[PDB]
Amino acid sequence: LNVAHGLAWSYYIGYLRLILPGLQARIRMFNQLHNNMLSGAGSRRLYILFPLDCGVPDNLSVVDPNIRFRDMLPQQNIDRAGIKNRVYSNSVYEILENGQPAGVCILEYATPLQTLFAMSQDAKSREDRLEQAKLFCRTLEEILEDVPESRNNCRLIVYQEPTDGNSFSLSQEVLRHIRQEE
């Protein structure tokens, strides 16, 4: 349709383009402080949760008994070529599998999906929201494909959280992605 394009571009321009080139330096800072806790597959990329249903939690953090908050990435004052950085909120979680920590992961939501959710809650549909969300995703995927540094430092985790039933597990989904990486 229309808004997906704008959402993808602004989310790149105003966020991903800004945070991705400084991420590894901040992972390094985090690992120096926290005895290499950010180690193992899936631990050194920004994983962006992209629920096509657009269910981003209000408070933006992952809320899930099997995805346990541990810590946030520290900040880097100055970027690689001497330009001052803004500040970024990035959270590191441990993924549980049967009560046992199975991985550590920098996880967050693709925040603009909230905008799509809001649009579908005004008196002036959900299937349109889904199509918009998909288009938002593939447009973002195309953009990242054009910058090879970015694609190295982040992965999109695209799924659909059903509105009811107990079939879907986000933690297993995140594990599924990391373990299948090649």
Add this chain to the structure above:
Amino acid sequence: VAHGLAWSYYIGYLRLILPGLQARIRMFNQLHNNMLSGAGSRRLYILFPLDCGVPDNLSVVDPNIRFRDMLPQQNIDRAGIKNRVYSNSVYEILENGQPAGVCILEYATPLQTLFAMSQDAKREDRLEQAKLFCRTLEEILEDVPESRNNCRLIVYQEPTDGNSFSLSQEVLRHIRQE
């Protein structure tokens, strides 16, 4: 879309940052010898250019609006819940080469979404959209009195050319007329 942008910008951002702001201003002033003082120094000022010209790097880029420092973080909110981290910059406003104020300033970031939409192969509509986004946001803030206490919208139109418009004077104009 304006409606959706207003609600998400509130829900996902303003609602989150405003209740913790005075505590961080306090933190900033204990560290920096009360530098954040004077009218217009203790509210979040949100630049809202209807033209939607938000700078790519999100910060204010202007010889008369000089970056000084960023607000520190507060780990835990008032009722014991862990806070996220926020980027908030403090500038000094110059008037004739003389500091005339200090101000926490930032752009209403979603306006970039409106700008991008108007750059697709598939502006007056953008302007209308921006206005609506603004008043929707204004109505929302009207319902939460704490929020309206801790932030002000600075709504203007930056012309695409000519030298008639000054952002620093505009911000001063707002603060002095409060």
